[PDB]
Structure formats: structure tokens, C-alpha cells
Amino acid sequence: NFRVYYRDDPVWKGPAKLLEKGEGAVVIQDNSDIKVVPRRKAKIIRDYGK
Amino acid sequence: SPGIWQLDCTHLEGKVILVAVHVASGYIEAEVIPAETGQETAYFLLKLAGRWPVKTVHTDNGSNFTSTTVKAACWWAGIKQEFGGVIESMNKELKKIIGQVRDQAEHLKTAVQMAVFIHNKKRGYSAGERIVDIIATDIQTK
Amino acid sequence: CSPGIWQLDCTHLEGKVILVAVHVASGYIEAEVIPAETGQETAYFLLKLAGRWPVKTVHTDNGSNFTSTTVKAACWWAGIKQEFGGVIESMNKELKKIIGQVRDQAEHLKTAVQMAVFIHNKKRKGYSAGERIVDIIATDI
Amino acid sequence: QNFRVYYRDDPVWKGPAKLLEKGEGAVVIQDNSDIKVVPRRKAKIIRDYGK
Ligand SMILES: Cc1ccc(C2CC2)c(-c2ccc3c(c2)CCCO3)c1[C@H](OC(C)(C)C)C(=O)O
Ligand SMILES: Cc1ccc(C2CC2)c(-c2ccc3c(c2)CCCO3)c1[C@H](OC(C)(C)C)C(=O)O
Ligand SMILES: [Cl-]
Ligand SMILES: [Mg+2]
Ligand SMILES: [Mg+2]
């Protein structure tokens, strides 16, 4: 699955649930709150190593 | 277990040495990192995970080891983190070898890697031979 | 071939220097982004590599960093024989290909480099390169 | 146990040179066909530790 880390405050928050990866913004959910974050403030990470 | 590592930082000459030990063998890798931060720790872990089958890393509660960038690296690479004496014993041993060889190199980091080599190659098996044997056995027997 | 034989070469992306080492018999690789393509950076890379693996021979082209005095010193101290003059060049291309596949997942080029190293070393044909180097070296003990 | 000497004159390092003699303040070395006296601080005497 995916986890999204994101910024607002320079500390990276998350993991949040990924909902949509847009060109300029990312839609996520973090603790039941829906958030829209700019692409540059989001880090979308897979569990590649399982 | 073949997949268990301990990581910790130690200091010499105002510089930060990040040390990884393969607990079952005593094998070590180390880097002088420019700052004792989560970002530098996370990059080190990604390199380590590409070389060996890193399944669990044990650390103390230093803020670099509990940082979000390290959690991200561990999630990507499939590493489980556990928190809270092998590496602390290993810190002292490495500093001892470093002090024995320090005047042979200009840079502290050169002495650090000389000491790592010396530690890993010393024999009737060395730590470098033991980690390769432990991991290959796990593979060769499913 | 010999379990002790490695090839090293530099490649370049985004204006940065990537130093790559390949264990010829397994395909296993290690890489680092170095700040300058110098003998001193190459020598330091070799000291680290020699501490991890039984490095007996390193094969390179005649790039001035590989023929430098500092690298000679490192190889002398570590017990490494140097030979000069297509495995690593094939590996450079494959590494650059994986980097491109994952590049937008990391801010820093060096982060994507290490992700690509991990991907290459862990992929099974049916052993992975990371399994073959450990299998080859343990058997040769 | 074998030794080679690397040294400066020019900030580029030279060598390997054969170690002829080590004194308290200088090393005497032979780089190809020239014998040189080099201050200790400008020389690195390196053993083939890996062996
Ligand atoms: C800074 C420097 C300059 C010159 C040398 C060699 C004389 C040729 C070495 C060197 C090169 C290799 C070497 C040792 C020393 C000592 C024994 C182990 O192998 C180093 C070295 O710095 C690096 C970054 C490694 C180049 C250092 O810190 O003195
Ligand atoms: C610069 C930066 C910031 C934040 C992160 C994480 C969101 C918390 C990562 C990161 C951390 C771990 C990680 C990946 C990315 C991508 C997948 C592999 O694991 C990186 C990262 O820089 C390093 C130097 C590695 C910290 C980068 O260049 O984006
Ligand atoms: Cl003298
Ligand atoms: Mg600590
Ligand atoms: Mg080249």
C-alpha cells in the first residue's frame, strides 16, 4: 500500500492515506480529515521492500 | 536472527560516526555523516538495505532514529524498527582501533574506514566471513 | 570468474557524479554520488568497499581518478590489484534506467540512486544479485 | 610485511617509492632511479596491511 508524508511547519507529517495524485495537488486523508496538499509538499511512498 | 542490526552514533574530533552492526556476526559498516540528523540516518539505512537483508534495526531513542525520514526509509525498504549492548561495546572497540591508526591518515573518515576493515577482517572466522556465511546459509536452506 | 573481481566506473546524471562498483560474477552493485570525480573520493570509496567484501582485483578504464596516486595507496594498503582497460558499462545503463523509473519518488538524485541499487540487487531472475554474491563468497571461504 | 612511500615536493602526491631508511625527521626513498630525502611530515609510509 501507499503512505503519504506531507508538510504544512517544516516537520514531515503522516503517514496519510493516498486518495488522488494530481499534477499540482494531492488529495489525502489523515486521521479522518480530508486534506489537499501541493505536490511539492507531498512524498508518496510505496512499501516496495514489503 | 540473520536480519537483525543495531545502529548508533559515536563522536570523534567533533564529527559524527554512524555505525551499523550485524548482531549475529559482529560485522560493521560506518560513515562519517555531516550532521546527526534523521535525513542523514535515512540515507545511510537505504544504502545498508541495498547490500544486506535488513529486517530489523534496533536503536536507542535518539531523535535522528525516531525521525519521520527514518520511518519513511524503513517503510519503503521493509525494515521493522525497535527501540531501547552490542553496538555500544562496538563503538568503544572502533574508537580504540581508530586511535591506534589515526596518525597514518590525514582525515578522520579515512581512519574510520581503516578501522572498519581491520575489525571486519580480523580472524577461525572473521566477522566479514561470518556475516556472509550466516546469510548464505539462510538462503541456501530456504 | 574469480569471486574477488570487481569493476568500477563513473556515470553522470543531473550534473552529478555517480561512482559505481559491480561484482562481476554476481551482478551485485554498490554506488555513491560523490562531490567531485577525483582520486581522493575514489580512494575513499574503495577503502569502504574493501572493508565489506573480499576485494582482490579492481578493473577500471584509464580515467584520471582511477590512475591517481591516492587510489594506488588505497589499493596497496587494502591488498587490491588494479587492472586497466563491458559489464560495468552495461550496468551503468541499467542503473540509469531504474533511476529514471523511480526518479519522481525522491527529491534528491542520491536517494533515487540508492533506491535503484536496492531494486537491482533484490530482483530475482532464480537468485537475485544480492543472493548470488553472498552465495559465491561464502562457498569460496 | 612490505612498505611503500607516498610523498610531496607540488601538491600532487608522488609514489609509490621504495623505503630506504626512516630517520626521526626525514625518510630516504628511491622513486624509480632518483634517491630523495623527504621530511617526515611530507611522507606517508604505507604497509600492505590487506596482504
Ligand atoms: C588526504 C590523503 C592524501 C594522500 C593519500 C595517499 C598518499 C597517497 C591519502 C591516503 C589514501 C589511501 C590510504 C591512506 C591515505 C592511508 C592508508 C589507507 O589508504 C589521503 C587520505 O584521504 C583519502 C580521502 C583516503 C584520499 C588520508 O586521510 O590521509
Ligand atoms: C528529502 C526527503 C524528505 C523527506 C523524506 C520522507 C517523507 C519523509 C525523504 C525520503 C526518505 C526515505 C525514502 C524516500 C524519501 C523515498 C523512498 C525511499 O525512502 C527525503 C529523501 O531524502 C533523504 C536524504 C533520503 C532523507 C528524498 O530525497 O526525497
Ligand atoms: Cl632524520
Ligand atoms: Mg546513541
Ligand atoms: Mg569511465
Author numbering:
A (entry chain C): 222 to 229, 232 to 273
B (entry chain D): 57 to 140, 149 to 187, 193 to 211
C (entry chain B): 56 to 140, 149 to 188, 193 to 208
D (entry chain A): 221 to 229, 232 to 273
Paper quotes:
To visualize the details of the interactions between the BDM-2 series of compounds and HIV-1 IN, we took advantage of a two-domain construct spanning the CTD and the CCD of HIV-1 IN, recently developed for X-ray cocrystallography with INLAIs. We crystallized this protein construct in the presence of the small molecules and refined the resulting cocrystal structures containing BDM-2, MUT871, MUT872, MUT884, and MUT916 to 1.8, 1.7, 2.1, 2.4, and 1.8 Å resolution, respectively. Similar to what was observed with BI-D and STP0404 (45), the asymmetric units of the two-domain cocrystal structures each contained a single CCD dimer with a pair of associated CTDs. Every CCD-CTD interface buried a molecule of INLAIs, well-defined in an electron density map. The BDM-2 series of INLAIs is based on a benzene scaffold and the compounds contain either the carboxyl and tert-butoxy groups (BDM-2 and MUT871) or a derivative of this motif, with the tert-butoxy side chain replaced by a cyclopropyloxy group (MUT872, MUT884, and MUT916). In particular, the tert-butoxy groups of BDM-2 and MUT871 make van der Waals contacts with Thr174, explaining why a substitution to a bulkier Ile residue at this position causes high-level resistance to these compounds. The carboxylate groups of the INLAIs form salt bridges with the Lys266 side chain. However, the interactions of the BDM-2 INLAIs with Tyr226 are mediated by cyclopropyl sidechains, and therefore lack the aromatic stacking component that was prominent in the case of BI-D, which features a bicyclic aromatic scaffold. Moreover, the compact nature of the benzene scaffold and small size of the cyclopropyl side chain allow the side chain of Trp235 to approach closer to the CCD than in complexes stabilized by STP0404 and BI-D, resulting in a shift of Trp235 Cα atom by 1.4 and 1.9 Å, respectively, concluding in a pronounced pivoting of the entire CTD domain.
Integrase (IN) is the essential retroviral enzyme responsible for insertion of the reverse transcribed viral genome into a host cell chromosome. INLAIs bind to HIV-1 IN and compete with LEDGF/p75, the host factor that directs lentiviral integration toward actively expressed genes. The primary INLAI-binding site on HIV-1 IN is a pocket at the core catalytic domain (CCD) dimerization interface. Acting as molecular glues, INLAIs induce a pathological interface involving HIV-1 IN CCD dimer and the CTD leading to hyper-multimerization and aggregation of the viral protein.
